[PDB]
Amino acid sequence: LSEIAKIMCDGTSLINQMKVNLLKKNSRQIFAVALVKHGLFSLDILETLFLNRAYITAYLPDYTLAEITKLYKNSSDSENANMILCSLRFLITNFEKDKRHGSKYKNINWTDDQEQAFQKKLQDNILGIFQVFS
Protein backbone atom coordinates (compact mmCIF):
# COMPACT_ATOMS: atom_id res chain seq x y z
CA LEU A 1 0.00 0.00 0.00
CA SER A 2 3.03 2.31 -0.16
CA GLU A 3 1.78 3.28 -3.61
CA ILE A 4 -1.65 3.68 -2.03
CA ALA A 5 0.15 5.66 0.66
CA LYS A 6 1.99 7.61 -2.03
CA ILE A 7 -1.04 8.11 -4.27
CA MET A 8 -3.11 9.30 -1.31
CA CYS A 9 -0.87 12.30 -0.61
CA ASP A 10 -0.32 12.62 -4.38
CA GLY A 11 -3.57 14.64 -4.58
CA THR A 12 -9.33 12.80 -3.08
CA SER A 13 -11.30 9.75 -4.20
CA LEU A 14 -10.40 10.13 -7.89
CA ILE A 15 -6.79 9.25 -7.04
CA ASN A 16 -7.63 5.55 -7.23
CA GLN A 17 -8.37 6.19 -10.90
CA MET A 18 -5.12 8.10 -11.40
CA LYS A 19 -3.35 5.37 -9.42
CA VAL A 20 -3.56 2.91 -12.32
CA ASN A 21 -2.32 5.31 -15.00
CA LEU A 22 0.35 7.01 -12.89
CA LEU A 23 1.60 3.54 -11.93
CA LYS A 24 3.09 2.84 -15.36
CA LYS A 25 2.94 6.46 -16.53
CA ASN A 26 6.48 7.08 -15.32
CA SER A 27 8.23 3.72 -15.75
CA ARG A 28 6.70 0.56 -17.10
CA GLN A 29 10.30 -0.25 -18.07
CA ILE A 30 12.60 1.09 -15.36
CA PHE A 31 9.99 -0.33 -13.00
CA ALA A 32 10.46 -3.62 -14.82
CA VAL A 33 14.19 -3.07 -15.24
CA ALA A 34 14.99 -2.44 -11.57
CA LEU A 35 12.64 -5.30 -10.75
CA VAL A 36 14.21 -7.41 -13.50
CA LYS A 37 17.49 -6.42 -11.90
CA HIS A 38 16.01 -6.88 -8.41
CA GLY A 39 15.00 -10.53 -8.48
CA LEU A 40 12.79 -12.12 -11.13
CA PHE A 41 12.61 -11.79 -14.92
CA SER A 42 9.43 -13.90 -15.16
CA LEU A 43 6.85 -12.34 -17.47
CA ASP A 44 4.09 -14.07 -15.49
CA ILE A 45 5.26 -12.29 -12.35
CA LEU A 46 5.66 -9.20 -14.53
CA GLU A 47 2.00 -9.64 -15.41
CA THR A 48 1.25 -10.24 -11.73
CA LEU A 49 3.36 -7.15 -11.04
CA PHE A 50 1.01 -4.82 -12.91
CA LEU A 51 -2.06 -7.05 -12.50
CA ASN A 52 -2.44 -5.64 -8.97
CA ARG A 53 -4.19 -2.54 -10.34
CA ALA A 54 -6.03 -3.09 -13.65
CA TYR A 55 -3.83 -5.58 -20.38
CA ILE A 56 -0.78 -6.36 -22.50
CA THR A 57 -0.59 -2.66 -23.40
CA ALA A 58 1.72 -2.49 -20.39
CA TYR A 59 3.81 -5.44 -21.58
CA LEU A 60 3.52 -4.36 -25.23
CA PRO A 61 5.80 -1.33 -24.97
CA ASP A 62 8.24 -3.45 -22.92
CA TYR A 63 10.45 -3.86 -25.99
CA THR A 64 13.29 2.73 -27.41
CA LEU A 65 13.34 4.44 -24.03
CA ALA A 66 12.79 1.11 -22.25
CA GLU A 67 16.03 -0.75 -23.00
CA ILE A 68 18.10 2.31 -22.02
CA THR A 69 17.43 2.73 -18.30
CA LYS A 70 18.13 -0.96 -17.73
CA LEU A 71 21.67 -0.22 -18.91
CA TYR A 72 22.06 2.63 -16.39
CA LYS A 73 22.52 0.35 -13.36
CA ASN A 74 25.98 -0.99 -14.25
CA SER A 75 27.56 0.83 -11.27
CA SER A 76 33.58 -9.25 -6.98
CA ASP A 77 30.58 -8.54 -4.75
CA SER A 78 29.31 -6.12 -7.41
CA GLU A 79 30.57 -8.40 -10.19
CA ASN A 80 27.09 -9.87 -10.53
CA ALA A 81 25.63 -6.36 -10.77
CA ASN A 82 26.85 -6.64 -14.35
CA MET A 83 25.78 -10.29 -14.58
CA ILE A 84 22.27 -9.45 -13.39
CA LEU A 85 22.13 -6.87 -16.16
CA CYS A 86 24.28 -8.99 -18.47
CA SER A 87 21.58 -11.65 -18.36
CA LEU A 88 19.03 -8.93 -19.11
CA ARG A 89 21.00 -8.32 -22.30
CA PHE A 90 20.41 -11.78 -23.81
CA LEU A 91 16.56 -11.91 -23.53
CA ILE A 92 14.30 -10.21 -26.21
CA THR A 93 11.53 -11.17 -28.78
CA ASN A 94 7.91 -12.38 -28.51
CA PHE A 95 8.83 -15.97 -29.35
CA GLU A 96 11.58 -16.00 -26.73
CA LYS A 97 9.73 -13.47 -24.56
CA ASP A 98 6.30 -15.07 -24.15
CA LYS A 99 7.81 -18.35 -22.92
CA ARG A 100 9.64 -19.69 -19.87
CA HIS A 101 12.96 -18.90 -21.53
CA GLY A 102 12.37 -15.63 -19.66
CA SER A 103 13.20 -17.57 -16.51
CA LYS A 104 15.83 -19.48 -18.51
CA TYR A 105 17.66 -16.30 -19.55
CA LYS A 106 19.06 -15.95 -16.03
CA ASN A 107 20.36 -19.52 -16.41
CA ILE A 108 23.25 -18.07 -18.45
CA ASN A 109 23.88 -20.80 -20.76
CA TRP A 110 24.33 -18.17 -23.46
CA THR A 111 23.90 -19.82 -26.84
CA ASP A 112 26.42 -19.20 -29.59
CA ASP A 113 23.39 -18.73 -31.84
CA GLN A 114 22.24 -15.48 -30.24
CA GLU A 115 25.81 -14.17 -29.96
CA GLN A 116 25.48 -12.82 -33.49
CA ALA A 117 21.68 -12.48 -33.26
CA PHE A 118 21.17 -9.91 -30.50
CA GLN A 119 24.23 -7.97 -31.62
CA LYS A 120 22.04 -7.32 -34.64
CA LYS A 121 19.14 -6.63 -32.28
CA LEU A 122 21.01 -4.30 -29.92
CA GLN A 123 22.53 -2.51 -32.91
CA ASP A 124 18.95 -2.00 -34.05
CA ASN A 125 18.17 0.05 -30.92
CA ILE A 126 21.80 1.08 -30.24
CA LEU A 127 21.03 4.39 -31.94
CA GLY A 128 17.65 4.96 -30.32
CA ILE A 129 19.01 4.54 -26.80
CA PHE A 130 21.58 7.29 -27.32
CA GLN A 131 18.77 9.45 -28.65
CA VAL A 132 17.45 9.04 -25.12
CA PHE A 133 20.92 9.36 -23.60
CA SER A 134 21.91 12.46 -25.55
Swiss-Prot record:
Q: Which domain of life is it from?
A: Eukaryota
Q: Where in the cell is it found?
A: Nucleus
Assembly and binders: Interacts with LCD1, which is required for localization MEC1 to the RPA complex. Interacts directly with the RPA subunits RFA1 and RFA2.
| Family that this chain belongs to | Belongs to the PI3/PI4-kinase family. ATM subfamily.
- Function text: Serine/threonine protein kinase which activates checkpoint signaling upon genotoxic stresses such as ionizing radiation (IR), ultraviolet light (UV), or DNA replication stalling, thereby acting as a DNA damage sensor. Recognizes the substrate consensus sequence [ST]-Q. Recruited in complex with protein LCD1 by the single-strand-binding protein complex RPA to DNA lesions in order to initiate the DNA repair by homologous recombination, after the MRX-complex and TEL1 are displaced. Phosphorylates LCD1 and RPA2, a subunit of RPA, involved in DNA replication, repair and recombination.
Q: What is this protein called?
A: Serine/threonine-protein kinase MEC1
Q: Which residues of the full protein are shown?
A: 741 to 888 of 2368
